[PDB]
Every structure is written in C-alpha cells, then in structure tokens.
Amino acid sequence: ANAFLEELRPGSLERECKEEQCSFEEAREIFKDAERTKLFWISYSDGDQCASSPCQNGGSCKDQLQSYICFCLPAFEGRNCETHKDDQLICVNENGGCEQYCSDHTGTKRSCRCHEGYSLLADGVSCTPTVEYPCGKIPILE
Amino acid sequence: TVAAYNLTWKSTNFKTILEWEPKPVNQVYTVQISTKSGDWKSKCFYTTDTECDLTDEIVKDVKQTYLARVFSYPEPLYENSPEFTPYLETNLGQPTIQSFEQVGTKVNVTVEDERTLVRRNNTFLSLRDVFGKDLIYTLYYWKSGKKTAKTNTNEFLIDVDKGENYCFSVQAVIPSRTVNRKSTDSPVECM
Amino acid sequence: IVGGKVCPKGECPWQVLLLVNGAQLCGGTLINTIWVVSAAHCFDKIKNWRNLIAVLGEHDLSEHDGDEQSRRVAQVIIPSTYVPGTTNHDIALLRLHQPVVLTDHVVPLCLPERTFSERTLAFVRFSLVSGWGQLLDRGATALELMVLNVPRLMTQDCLQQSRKVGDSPNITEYMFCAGYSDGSKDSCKGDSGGPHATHYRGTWYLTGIVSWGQGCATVGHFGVYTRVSQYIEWLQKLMRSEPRPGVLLRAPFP
Ligand SMILES: CCS(=O)(=O)N[C@H](Cc1c[nH]c2ccccc12)C(=O)N[C@@H](CCC(N)=O)C(=O)NCc1ccc(C(=N)N)cc1
Ligand SMILES: *[C@@H]1O[C@H](CO)[C@@H](O)[C@H](O)[C@H]1O
Ligand SMILES: *[C@@H]1O[C@@H](C)[C@@H](O)[C@@H](O)[C@@H]1O
Ligand SMILES: [Ca+2]
Ligand SMILES: [Ca+2]
Ligand SMILES: [Ca+2]
Ligand SMILES: [Ca+2]
Ligand SMILES: [Ca+2]
Ligand SMILES: [Ca+2]
Numbered sequence: 042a043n044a045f046l047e048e049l050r051p052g053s054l055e056r057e058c059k060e061e062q063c064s065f066e067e068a069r070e071i072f073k074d075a076e077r078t079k080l081f082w083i084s085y086s087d088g089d090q091c092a093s094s095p096c097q098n099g100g101s102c103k104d105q106l107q108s109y110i111c112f113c114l115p116a117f118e119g120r121n122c123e124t125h126k127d128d129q130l131i132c133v134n135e136n137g138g139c140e141q142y143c144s145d146h147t148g149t150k151r152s153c154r155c156h157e158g159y160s161l162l163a164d165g166v167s168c169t170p171t172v173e174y175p176c177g178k179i180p181i182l183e
Numbered sequence: 184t185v186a187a188y189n190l191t192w193k194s195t196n197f198k199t200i201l202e203w204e205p206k207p208v209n210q211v212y213t214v215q216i217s218t219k220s221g222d223w224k225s226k227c228f229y230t231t232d233t234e235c236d237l238t239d240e241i242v243k244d245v246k247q248t249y250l251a252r253v254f255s256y257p258e259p260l261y262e263n264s265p266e267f268t269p270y271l272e273t274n275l276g277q278p279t280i281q282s283f284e285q286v287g288t289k290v291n292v293t294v295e296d297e298r299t300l301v302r303r304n305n306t307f308l309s310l311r312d313v314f315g316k317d318l319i320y321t322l323y324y325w326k327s328g329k330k331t332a333k334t335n336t337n338e339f340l341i342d343v344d345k346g347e348n349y350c351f352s353v354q355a356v357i358p359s360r361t362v363n364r365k366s367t368d369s370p371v372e373c374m
Numbered sequence: 375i376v377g378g379k380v381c382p383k384g385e386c387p388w389q390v391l392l393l394v395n396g397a398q399l400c401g402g403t404l405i406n407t408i409w410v411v412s413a414a415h416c417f418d419k420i421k422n423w424r425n426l427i428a429v430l431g432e433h434d435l436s437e438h439d440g441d442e443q444s445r446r447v448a449q450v451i452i453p454s455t456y457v458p459g460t461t462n463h464d465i466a467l468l469r470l471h472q473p474v475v476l477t478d479h480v481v482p483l484c485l486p487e488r489t490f491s492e493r494t495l496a497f498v499r500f501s502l503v504s505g506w507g508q509l510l511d512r513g514a515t516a517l518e519l520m521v522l523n524v525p526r527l528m529t530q531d532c533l534q535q536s537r538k539v540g541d542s543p544n545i546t547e548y549m550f551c552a553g554y555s556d557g558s559k560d561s562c563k564g565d566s567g568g569p570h571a572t573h574y575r576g577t578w579y580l581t582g583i584v585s586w587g588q589g590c591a592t593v594g595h596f597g598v599y600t601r602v603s604q605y606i607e608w609l610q611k612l613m614r615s616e617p618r619p620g621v622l623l624r625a626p627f628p
C-alpha cells in the first residue's frame with residue numbers, strides 16, 4: 042500500500058507485501074524482473090480459497106491455486122466432506138450389508154432376508170442353513 | 184434419459200473426483216468404480232450432481248488402474264470414463280517452502296512434506312511416504328540470472344553470496360512420469 | 375470348455391449331464407431335488423421325448439462310481455416365445471421323474487430373487503461356467519467335467535468390444551455376454567444348458583445358462599448366456615404347477 046512519501050524509500054517485500062497488501066506495481070518495484078514478479082504474483086494474489094471454510098463435518102481445508110482440497114474424517118467423504126458414509130444403508134449399496142437378500146424401506150431402514158433353506162441370524166444380516174444340504178454350498182469344502 | 188459425457192478425472196494429491204455432463208434434467212445418476220478384475224462398487228447413489236468423489240476408493244491401492252462408469256436414470260444408459268491410475272496421474276499439489284536457515288555461505292531450503300488423502304493406520308500419508316524415491320523437488324532461485332537445484336529429499340543445500348538476498352521457489356516432480364510430471368510453482372519466499 | 379481346467383470331483387455338484395438315447399446331449403443345472411434348468415435349444419431335434427435322461431453327481435465320463443444318480447426327464451418346459459434354431463429365450467425347465475438324493479456330490483445351485491440378481495450378482499465380476507463340452511471349437515468333448523472363470527460384461531460394452539458381423543443374432547435383454555475376446559477362454563456347444571454360477575458372500579447362485587456365441591473362443595467375440603434373472607418368476611410359477619400328460623410343454627412368457 043502507498044502512504045504519503047513512502048515511495049521515496051526503496052522497495053521492501055516485508056514492509057510492502059507482508060506487513061501490508063502490495064499492488065502488482067509495488068511488487069514489480071521489488072522484484073524488478075518480469076518473470077520474477079509474475080512468479081511471485083501468481084501465489085500472492087491467488088487468494089485463500091479455504092477462507093469460506095468449505096470443508097464440512099470437521100474436515101480440513103488445504104489451499105491451492107484457485108482451488109482447495111478437503112481432507113475428511115473417517116466417516117466422511119465428498120468434495121467438501123458433505124457425504125455421510127453412515128447414511129448409505131440402502132440395498133443398491135453393497136447389497137445393504139445383507140448376506141443374501143436386501144429389501145429397502147423408505148422412512149426406516151432396509152431389512153435383510155434369506156433364500157429357502159436358510160434363516161436370518163440375530164444380527165439381522167447373516168443367513169445360516171436350516172437343512173443339511175442348502176443350495177449354493179459345496180459340501181466337500183465346508 | 185441421456186448418457187453422461189465428457190467424463191473427466193479431477194485428482195490432486197489423490198483427492199479424486201469424477202465429473203461429467205450434462206446438468207441433469209429429469210434424470211439422476213449412480214456411479215460405479217472398479218479395477219479390471221474386481222467387482223463393481225456403486226457410489227453417489229441417485230445424485231443430481233454431475234460429480235462424484237471416489238477418493239476413499241482409489242486410495243485403497245493407488246497403483247491399481249481404475250475404471251468408472253455413470254448410469255443415467257429418468258440395463259440403464261451409461262458411459263465409461265477414461266482409465267485412471269492414481270500413482271501415475273494424480274496431480275502434485277502446489278508445494279510450500281517450510282523454511283530456510285543460513286549457515287555462513289550456505290542456505291538450507293526445506294520443503295514442507297505435505298499430506299495426501301491416502302490413509303494409513305488412522306493417519307494421512309505424505310507425498311514422500313507414497314512416492315518415496317519417485318519424488319524429487321526442484322528449486323528455482325535467484326540473487327535478488329536464473330538458478331536451479333534438485334534434491335531427492337525435502338531439502339536443498341545451496342551456496343550464496345554473503346550480504347546479497349535470494350528468493351526461492353520449488354516444484355514437486357516425479358521424473359519417471361510422462362504426464363503431470365510437475366506441480367505448479369510454490370509461493371515465492373525471500374530471505 | 376475352452377481354456378479351462380478340470381472341476382475337482384465334488385466342486386461342481388449342481389452340474390447336470392443330459393442324455394438322449396444314452397448319448398451325451400447337454401449340460402444343465404439342479405436348483406432343487408426335482409427341477410433342472412437347462413437351455414431350450416438343446417431340444418431342437420429331439421424325437422424320442424421318452425428317452426431323455428439327467429445324470430447328477432457325474433464327473434469322469436469314463437468311470438462309474440456311487441455318486442452318480444440317473445433320473446428320467448418327465449417334463450421339458452420351454453417358453454412359448456422360443457423358436458427352434460434361434461437364440462432368444464434360450465431356457466428350459468426340466469422336471470425329474472423322481473427327486474435326486476442330496477449328498478456331498480449332488481447339491482442344488484440357488485435360484486436367486488430377481489432384484490438381488492440384477493442389483494448385486496450382475497455386478498460380481500467373475501462367475502463359473504462348466505460342462506463336458508468341446509475343448510476346442512469343433513473338437514472333441516471332455517471326459518472330465520471342466521470349469522472356467524469368466525468376467526461378465528454389460529451388453530453395451532459387449533457390442534462395442536465385439537467384431538461386428540453380418541447376420542449375427544441380436545444380443546437381447548434376455549441375454550448377457552461373459553468371457554474373453556482374445557480367443558483363449560470360453561464355453562462351447564457341448565456345454566449348452568450348463569450353469570454360469572456366481573459366488574456371493576458364501577453362497578453360489580444361478581445367473582446364466584450357456585447359450586450361444588460365434589464359434590468357441592473366437593477372437594473378437596464373447597460367449598452369450600441366457601440372463602436367468604428375467605425368468606425367475608416364470609420358473610417359480612412352473613415349479614408349483616401340476617405335471618402335464620406329455621413330456622414337452624410350451625408355457626407362455628412373460
Ligand atoms: C456362427 C454359427 S455358430 O458358431 O453356431 N453360432 C450360432 C449363433 C449364430 C448364428 N449365426 C451367426 C452369425 C454370426 C455370429 C453368430 C451366429 C449358435 O451359437 N447357435 C446355437 C444354436 C441355435 C439353435 N437354436 O440351434 C449354438 O450353437 N449354441 C451353442 C453354443 C454354446 C456356447 C457358445 C459359446 N460360448 N461360444 C457357442 C454356441
Ligand atoms: C470457499 O471458496 C471457494 C473458492 O473456490 C469456493 O469454491 C467455496 O464454495 C467457498 O466455500
Ligand atoms: C484436519 O484434518 C481433518 C480430517 C481433521 O483431523 C481435523 O481435525 C484436522 O485439523
Ligand atoms: Ca507502504
Ligand atoms: Ca508502497
Ligand atoms: Ca514501492
Ligand atoms: Ca515484520
Ligand atoms: Ca506499514
Ligand atoms: Ca511504478
């Protein structure tokens with residue numbers, strides 16, 4: 042920034058761009074060279090895209106040139122960590138964790154089922170055989 | 184419905200997002216990703232967005248080659264994406280000079296070993312942890328005349344004229360790479 | 375099977391051997407003690423409908439052991455929409471005259487529910503195909519039951535990744551491709567009717583039937599299998615129906 046007469050003093054990166062915001066011209070007077078000034082200005086004037094605090098659910102924002110990167114907590118994902126990994130318990134998603142059959146239920150939670158010759162265990166997801174020779178199982182390997 | 188098109192990978196330091204067109208109108212999407220010999224896994228179920236974060240999936244093995252496809256809903260219409268090999272294609276993020284101390288006629292320039300999205304034992308691995316020897320850093324400095332240096336670590340030890348002041352800038356680089364071999368230049372720092 | 379390996383005796387317990395007049399005819403799949411799923415085209419030229427035999431617990435066609443069980447096929451049900459000599463709706467449900475005994479070497483493959491199959495099983499990359507079919511296109515059949523692990527493809531990819539031919543049959547919604555296009559691995563003619571079995575979380579399911587393709591293991595082409603998910607309702611309703619007078623029965627589809 043420029044104040045009364047300060048421009049009489051030689052350029053200073055610290056006093057002009059660090060302790061204050063310096064325009065391109067002020068930066069140019071410090072670095073002189075064209076390429077040098079440009080190499081400096083690209084980052085100096087890019088602006089911290091993490092200022093908006095875009096990373097949701099306790100994620101961490103890492104600033105980049107004209108963009109950011111969100112590192113999310115284990116239970117989260119998505120560009121801005123907006124996706125709840127725990128809110129994906131639907132049948133199309135890995136068969137809903139069900140060992141055999143999956144049935145969706147709007148408003149509640151999906152339920153699991155089993156093929157004839159099997160019964161749903163107490164965990165509500167696994168199936169165990171209720172006959173000596175259930176379908177789909179290979180005896181000499183069981 | 185219309186099949187998605189222009190499927191593109193946007194990945195930096197392994198944060199990997201699949202984008203496509205067009206802005207959905209009366210149609211939703213569901214994405215599937217996999218390795219050539221693995222099962223298809225669905226992601227971003229019935230989203231109206233034209234993007235899908237696949238980071239958690241690709242960091243499981245950044246050296247595998249992945250293929251994704253976008254289904255369109257009003258077998259369903261879909262479009263395959265370009266293959267994506269994280270290790271060979273994820274852009275190197277902009278570096279950050281962590282510091283530099285002068286010791287007589289020499290200066291030690293240290294480069295911050297930034298973290299990536301690759302998890303490991305409840306932590307985030309650094310660019311070094313992931314690329315190991317494949318990663319080097321290049322320095323582009325000048326006596327405040329161009330000068331450059333290279334290191335296989337995260338630090339540069341160079342000579343300097345007593346009294347004079349220097350400015351520094353670094354880049355992350357994976358020499359073996361063919362595409363996205365270099366990161367953008369870091370912010371400029373001067374002593 | 376071209377490019378596969380022997381299925382260790384007992385590890386393909388639902389595989390069925392179909393014979394006509396004591397001659398090898400086709401493969402098939404047991405889905406319960408009384409019903410067998412096979413391919414409709416396996417019956418295009420049958421004349422002696424009373425001489426159809428289904429053998430379970432088979433393995434080595436050159437040695438007899440106690441795991442073998444033979445049953446007369448009392449009924450062959452085919453969709454009214456299937457046309458002999460063609461490829462669509464290539465499926466058949468066979469009722470055995472007497473139920474087979476379930477043992478360590480004779481077990482049924484699971485017929486899954488429709489949505490489970492379409493939504494989950496259809497996306498399991500690999501599945502097993504087996505039979506005593508030709509080891510090479512136009513070659514001799516196998517003495518020991520062979521098995522092959524093949525990758526499945528969505529039809530759009532099959533078409534795009536295949537060599538367009540003059541008058542090849544269309545790949546309908548009642549079909550799906552699986553295998554390799556480099557000419558190394560595939561099922562073959564004598565394997566027809568055999569199962570395309572999918573392993574999912576500890577259990578094997580019936581997802582396909584060896585149906586057709588351009589020759590066997592032909593460069594630029596994949597094997598085509600009947601998409602069983604489309605016939606789940608059709609099959610279940612028929613398994614609850616009363617036996618008919620004659621052997622051959624054409625039932626409406628849907
Ligand atoms: C090319 C003649 S062919 O090789 O016999 N293919 C025809 C289809 C067929 C007929 N015309 C065509 C033109 C271009 C490509 C395919 C075909 C074909 O496959 N016809 C059916 C019988 C049709 C009937 N109802 O009688 C047949 O041979 N099925 C047995 C079979 C099983 C597995 C595979 C395999 N996995 N590989 C191949 C064949
Ligand atoms: C924070 O700033 C970035 C700049 O790109 C913007 O994209 C986010 O939406 C905002 O939260
Ligand atoms: C940044 O990373 C995220 C995942 C959380 O661990 C935050 O606490 C941290 O600041
Ligand atoms: Ca000033
Ligand atoms: Ca000034
Ligand atoms: Ca100035
Ligand atoms: Ca100061
Ligand atoms: Ca000031
Ligand atoms: Ca000026």
Ligand SMILES: [Ca+2]
Nearest residue numbers: 048066067070
């Ligand atoms: Ca000025």
Ligand SMILES: [Ca+2]
Nearest residue numbers: 087088089105
């Ligand atoms: Ca920035």
Ligand SMILES: [Ca+2]
Nearest residue numbers: 434435437438
């Ligand atoms: Ca035998």
